[PDB]
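User: quick one - fold this with dodecyl-beta-D-maltoside bound?
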Amino acid sequence: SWDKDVYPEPPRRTPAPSPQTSLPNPITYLTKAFDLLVDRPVTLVREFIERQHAKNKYYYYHREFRRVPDITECQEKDVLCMFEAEMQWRRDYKVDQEIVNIIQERLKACQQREGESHRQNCAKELEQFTQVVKAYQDRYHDLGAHYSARKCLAKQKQRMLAERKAAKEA
Amino acid sequence: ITKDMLPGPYPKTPEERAAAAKKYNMRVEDYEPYPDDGTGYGDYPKLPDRSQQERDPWYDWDHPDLRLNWGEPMHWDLDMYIRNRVDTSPTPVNWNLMCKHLFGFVAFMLFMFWVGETYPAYQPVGPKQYPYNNLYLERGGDPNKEPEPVVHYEI
Amino acid sequence: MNMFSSLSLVTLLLLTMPIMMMSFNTYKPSNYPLYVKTAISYAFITSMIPTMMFIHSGQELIISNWHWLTIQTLKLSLSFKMDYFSMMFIPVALFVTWSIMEFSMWYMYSDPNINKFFKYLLLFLITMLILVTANNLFQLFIGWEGVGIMSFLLIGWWYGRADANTAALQAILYNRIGDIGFILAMAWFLTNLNTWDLQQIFMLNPSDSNMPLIGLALAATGKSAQFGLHPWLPSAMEGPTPVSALLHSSTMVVAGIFLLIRFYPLTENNKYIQSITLCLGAITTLFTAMCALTQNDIKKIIAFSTSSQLGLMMVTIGINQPYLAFLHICTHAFFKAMLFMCSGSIIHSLNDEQDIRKMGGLFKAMPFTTTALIVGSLALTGMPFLTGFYSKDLIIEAANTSYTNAWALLMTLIATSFTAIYSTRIIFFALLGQPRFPTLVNINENNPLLINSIKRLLIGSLFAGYIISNNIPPTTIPQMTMPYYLKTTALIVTILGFILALEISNMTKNLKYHYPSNAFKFSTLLGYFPTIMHRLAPYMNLSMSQKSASSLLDLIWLEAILPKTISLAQMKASTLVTNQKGLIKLYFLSFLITILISMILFNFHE
Amino acid sequence: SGYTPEEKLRLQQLRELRRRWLKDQELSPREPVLPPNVIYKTYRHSIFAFTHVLIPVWIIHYYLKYHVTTKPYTIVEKKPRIFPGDTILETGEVIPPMKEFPDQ
Amino acid sequence: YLTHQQKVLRLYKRALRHLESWCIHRDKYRYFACLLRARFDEHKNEKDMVKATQLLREAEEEFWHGQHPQPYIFPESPGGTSYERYECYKVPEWCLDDWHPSEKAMYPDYFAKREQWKKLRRESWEREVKQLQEETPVGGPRTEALPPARKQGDLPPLWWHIVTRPRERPM
Amino acid sequence: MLKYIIPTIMLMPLTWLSKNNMIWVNSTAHSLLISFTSLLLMNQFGDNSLNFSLLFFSDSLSTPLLILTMWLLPLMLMASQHHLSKENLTRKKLFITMLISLQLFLIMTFTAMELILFYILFEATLVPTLIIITRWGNQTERLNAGLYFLFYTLAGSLPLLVALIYIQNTVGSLNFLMLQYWVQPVHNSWSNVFMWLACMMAFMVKMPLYGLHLWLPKAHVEAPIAGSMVLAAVLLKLGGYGMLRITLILNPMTDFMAYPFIMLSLWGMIMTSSICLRQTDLKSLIAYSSVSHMALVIVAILIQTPWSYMGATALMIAHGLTSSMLFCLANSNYERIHSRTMILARGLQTLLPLMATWWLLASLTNLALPPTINLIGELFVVMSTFSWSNITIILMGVNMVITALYSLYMLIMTQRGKYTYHINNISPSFTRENALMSLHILPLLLLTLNPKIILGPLY
Ligand SMILES: CCCCCCCCCCCCO[C@@H]1O[C@H](CO)[C@@H](O[C@H]2O[C@H](CO)[C@@H](O)[C@H](O)[C@H]2O)[C@H](O)[C@H]1O
Ligand SMILES: CCCCCCCCCCCCO[C@@H]1O[C@H](CO)[C@@H](O[C@H]2O[C@H](CO)[C@@H](O)[C@H](O)[C@H]2O)[C@H](O)[C@H]1O
Ligand SMILES: CCCCCCCCCCCCO[C@@H]1O[C@H](CO)[C@@H](O[C@H]2O[C@H](CO)[C@@H](O)[C@H](O)[C@H]2O)[C@H](O)[C@H]1O
Ligand SMILES: CCCCCCCCCCCCO[C@@H]1O[C@H](CO)[C@@H](O[C@H]2O[C@H](CO)[C@@H](O)[C@H](O)[C@H]2O)[C@H](O)[C@H]1O
Ligand SMILES: CCCCCCCCCCCCO[C@@H]1O[C@H](CO)[C@@H](O[C@H]2O[C@H](CO)[C@@H](O)[C@H](O)[C@H]2O)[C@H](O)[C@H]1O
Ligand SMILES: CCCCCCCCCCCCO[C@@H]1O[C@H](CO)[C@@H](O[C@H]2O[C@H](CO)[C@@H](O)[C@H](O)[C@H]2O)[C@H](O)[C@H]1O
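Assistant: Sure. Structure tokens for the protein plus dodecyl-beta-D-maltoside:
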């Protein structure tokens, strides 16, 4: 249904029923009633719907975008090149927003899954979130509402200049 | 409504004052305009600064909810003095005394909370002790480093 | 999993069905109130199933079913937290609402708009469940403001009465001031943690949480009616008694406390916020109990009781016992709802009389209401092993043995003694002695809807606290070692309150006429806070609105400095230009001046 | 202090009219003219449970099973607690018991 | 505008109600209600009006000092807990004229009788106005009092909104 | 855009060649059809805007503004046809022609590619609007309202014309797509300060900015209902749309030039909210409520953040439906009691139950009850201004309290309490009036189910 590598889940460890009471478990009978009254009728309706879908199989595709020269290769004021570089940058910006959203979803899922041990047991997810938020902030933060590839490039060059200066004097 | 029955400029002469009182359906002896600063009151009457809550609730008012009669001059701040807003009714305790007790009570409590903060109550016990170097890993400590050991002895 | 999640969602969906049918699809106004009451009772049953699964195995989950909106890196989804706090509060809230709606089928029977009343009660319930199961701050804010607006509509139920409209707007006003703190927390969390989801907030666990937590504290101050934003709660007694019962037990007022419990992973690491909440709760519990000592309106006494109990929960937050604060929410919902319904029973019997000075002699005339009122009073004051004992006594023991503000501890203990005093005040003046009500006796409490609804809450007020404490998992280490005088403090100061209250009450029967002290007037008039603040603040704000903002600036100076001055200058210039004599001699003379100036002054000839 | 004779007469005349008006508010027998045991308590509760519990839970379960839980992280459960001496259903692993306690 | 007697009697009633708010118990209130009546009785025959006004003036100051800060209010009295509670159910009678014909058809007999009341109001209006004209001084009415019907077959002038007013419990 | 411009133009022959008694039926039916086709503009792409030709383009900002504009024309026709009943035929058709011409200018204004084309249509809207106010308003004050409206606009707009012509000389183009790529930074000089002011003041007056807002309470109190609806719903948003576009070429000078206008707006919204608490004219109260709401939009546009631009877009659309609905609600009372005084007719819930429900729903959207798009817009601006400076939460939070008080004060005063005894002509709500209110509130609340379509390009 979804890629487990993209949305990982640790293997699930359920304990076996180990009762130490003679009373019947009300949940067990309710569980059986639910599977009989709710699950079985629901599954039959779905299986009928899946039969109709199997008769009419058709396909859709994930659009693929070829890479084009980015803003750094565009001559000043050459709108024809700047336009394609700008459109590509805007698409990449939307993709990076969703990459951060995937990492945040991993982090939130880990916190709920690990319960009271989440602080120790979600260190890897918190690290990856921390690193990706830093990279995303470096690319896109402070550009303003009228952002562009040109402004993003100006931001990067300022950062590279500072990093060069610090490295040289060090 | 004709222009002669609408509010006008501040009345300068006694004839104007008598005319303004008539327009507002008041006795010339009861009619008093707002002071003629440049604030824009004109000749509109200055009526007692009282809430409509203060009016007699048993009188057969034309507008019972407002306690207003048709044609009587409305207070400039009538909309502030409706029964849902500012009440000026007399109070069983003097206003000035009421402020002293409310402020005094609040000030005393705030003082005593500072005192109780400086001299907290507590029990005669030592600190709670936790194993594994005060739960260094569980509290999120870096696995790759090493905390200085926290050791707890029996007593 | 599949049964747990399905049933938890069917509970919420069941509650919306009577609202949707109001779209006339399958609509039978014959007995809409019974339809709504039946829906609540069924929802209560379905909500017990996932509650049992949590009690058994501790099962919890989060349902993020619908993706609503993505704002760049902030994905907003309809998400439901089905955990400890929601799986225990929902059945308690539904059980209490079940009784309240059954009580209302009797109490509001002659209301021409009874169908709209039950629709509003159900909407009140739905918004609170949205609040309690919300997993993100935006979904929580929906329920937060939802309950606030539903209170406005129910407090102002009798909209022809000016006092009812004033109280309704007062609740909105005080709650909107608290909402400033709520939006402050949302802004801080979005700016600093890039999230409104609880998971991410707790995972990142900021150390510098003073600003967001002060915001949450301010929101709780308004919604739970803590000192400073407190007067609106006693004013909400303008609403029909069923509104007071539901408002004070299992909806609006506990929402402020519930918000602070939901954020205990942050507050439990911030001792500064603990100190503030502790002190805010302590003054609230003491101040409002003091006000209750001298109130004569039965609903107002119970209202001030709720504020005092809410202050106690805020104290419990302050001493870092969030799960005990939650337990008190659950236990308090039973006997406090019962107390309002008992007062509704008396009020109805005495033809809308609400002054306890005009009651009395009802102990034998209303035996069942009497029994429920005594049980509820004992549960409230912490009688051992009734429902209130299983939270209040742990809270007092925890406060006594905690490292805490000493003054706040004393205020809490004294307010506990006052709880016994004002409870005695209701029993003494309402039930004992000789009747003081009018001569045409219409007392009658034999309607089965009245009896059954009170009966269910009576059973809860006896056993609910015991049953809940014995099923919830432990989440702290209770402090069970302490000196005898710290163990029994709650019972001792409560008993002395009863003894002191009885002496005060019996002294009212002596043929001596006493003059009021300043303390008596301070208590009677609620410390003058409503008298001063509700007159001074509206007056100053409303005077500025007209004198300065409207008249001085908009009607005068902003007109004067631009359009009025510009127009004046043009008019004067026009008169200068056009006021000419029409004389050939003068016009041609100005030609001579023009030509001369053109050369001598401006050298146009070069 | 007492009604003047003229006040007495006016109140008497208004009183007659008001009582005639109130008497005129009574509905006649035909108004409004409208245009054209235990077991029966099980039925209403049976049909109500079917249309307000069974049908909604059929819809929700279908919705959750075949749409919500087919997407990542839409329903996330806290993992079950595992105590010493437990057996894992997935693997058959047996968690060892805790050490032997000192006597207390 | 209130005479001296009216002021003294209003103070007596007001003081008894606040006294009853303090006492609560009926036997206790009876005891002090008699003591209070004795104080008013001790000066009942005072003749020097200057002295009597001073007594009333002082009594009002004593009442203000000793009033209950939260006196009992009858539930439907102004400031009471049921005051104005039923105003939202009071609908003016003229609203019925706007009913759809199918709504009126549900109460044929009520609306036949209503049509007779409107006929009575119409036939009587001109005589009502005329009576007020010929009984009002030239300057105008100096009080709000209204007269009764004089001739037989006449109705008291300005009766409609008193007679047809909403019921106190209209639903 | 020709698929919208041409059918809009055809509404004029339709109205003039209709049978005498079918002018309202025909114009209303076909303007609703045009509105239906406007949904085809939702074909928006994540990266590129929808660029039809050398003259017209539509992106996520102009699309919701277009759909609101085309939705309002039929609503305005329904709202107007009662108070125009006694007007003679030719003068009715002229009134409808002015409404159609306003829609024509507006859809071209919101889709013009070139800033000078935008300016001309931006300015053409004055003529039909001024005519509607001064010819079909009821009171003497409409003539003065027309003059204030006219000269406040032109005082700022003529400097804008000079600035735009200067920009085209310097840059070579005013095409907005071109300006996205050829934009250069604005350096500090007194020349650029006045270039900045000329580029922004015309839009500030239309919002209106606090201090330049005096024309607005005049224009509403005097305009007929249809004039009030388009003035509140759309014409104010010309200013917001204007700034959202022109701010592209004013950076980084906006960093500090915004300060005086943020202060006026932040303080202005509290002043104008407080004013609403003491207004005696119901139409004037609703007019002052618009000033307070648009103060947020000005702040949002000026601080230039993705969250503030999304909140500004949602706020403009949400206020359009709410404010227009409130004017329609106030007008329905006016058609019965023929006075705008708020305190004159009270307890109307007793007499008009369903209408009181529309009053409640309009009030709750006005005070931004979550999750209405009113709240979504305001909250996004609150979130972004807090990042601008944390202290703004004090002003924004206080304004939320005041907004609730006056929103519910208006509800309580007119709907609750006791009815006025002598007002006996409150006839039952007509089907036309009820349908008019539902066609405001229903789309407003339906948008809560899919807010992204009204969040603008920054989404
Ligand atoms: C368990 C409760 C713990 C908290 C208890 C808090 C109690 C603190 C009370 C502080 C308030 C005292 O406030 C004080 O009251 C007295 C009594 O009138 C006032 O006293 C003054 O006014 C009275 C009456 O006008 C006059 O006799 C005289 O002018 C003067 O005595 C003081 O001007 C005021 O400052
Ligand atoms: C901030 C940028 C925009 C500023 C625009 C300023 C230019 C002027 C705009 C309004 C011009 C309207 O033109 C004229 O104005 C004046 C007041 O201003 C109006 O006059 C009004 O005020 C004057 C003086 O208080 C009164 O004598 C008059 O009775 C009243 O109607 C005229 O009736 C109107 O014909
Ligand atoms: C930012 C630059 C904007 C430039 C815009 C230029 C707009 C010029 C508008 C017309 C100016 C003259 O407009 C004229 O103003 C004067 C006063 O203001 C008005 O005059 C009215 O108010 C004045 C002031 O109390 C009275 O003295 C006068 O008796 C009265 O008639 C005229 O009725 C109006 O016709
Ligand atoms: C060589 C170039 C010439 C180009 C001319 C193109 C258009 C020629 C149109 C000729 C027909 C005009 O029609 C004439 O005007 C109107 C509009 O129809 C008609 O009468 C009108 O009454 C009302 C409007 O008042 C409407 O119902 C409708 O518009 C029409 O019936 C006249 O009864 C008819 O005599
Ligand atoms: C929100 C609802 C709005 C209602 C609007 C009502 C007006 C509807 C206008 C319909 C216009 C259809 O216009 C016409 O549609 C047909 C489909 O049969 C398209 O037909 C074409 O579509 C695409 C084009 O890439 C290709 O599959 C192929 O070339 C062909 O099928 C035409 O490209 C288009 O010219
Ligand atoms: C609602 C009203 C809004 C009003 C807003 C007012 C904003 C005021 C902005 C002030 C900045 C103006 O722009 C500023 O002007 C100064 C001259 O004084 C310019 O100064 C320029 O000439 C001076 C010579 O004196 C040189 O020393 C300097 O090197 C050079 O920059 C700056 O280049 C520019 O930074």
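One thing worth noting: Chain F touches chain E at residues 347, 349-351, 416-419, 421, 424, 427-428 (CB under 8 Å).
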